[PDB]
Amino acid sequence: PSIELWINYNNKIAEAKALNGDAETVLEGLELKEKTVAEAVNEIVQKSMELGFISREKENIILISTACDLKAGEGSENKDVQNKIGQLFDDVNKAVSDLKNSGITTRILNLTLEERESSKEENISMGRYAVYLKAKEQNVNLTIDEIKDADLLELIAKLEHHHHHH
């Protein structure tokens, strides 16, 4: 499942858009618009669990990548939106603790909108693209070809093991 949850200025989901056909079958039947990120993560992971797109008994990996462009402020100061973004990431990390608790690895990556745009033209989701980000940070040569064809299990494993083995 590959999904992009648009979050609007009310700290609610504007629209949910799947990038993978299996994720379409996850989104169907779920109200996600007046939910927060943690809510969406929980809805998506739990439906993927039922449907067999993620295993509860088997070891998996979930990547929550959030990309945020703050080009607005409103009120009298941009800290109004920054408090919303604080609550946003507050909510994101709580989902991680909730969904990973079953013995599944869940991780958080942060991206900018410019990174989101790069993943859109390659029609890939931001989670797998965020492992590509870590490849660039650790100076490992992973290509966009690698990222789009590979499994997220392989992607997170190779990057986090790179930072473990010398």
Place this chain on the structure above:
Amino acid sequence: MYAYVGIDIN
């Protein structure tokens, strides 16, 4: 405009 959350599973 605000945030975009990418959820990748598998």
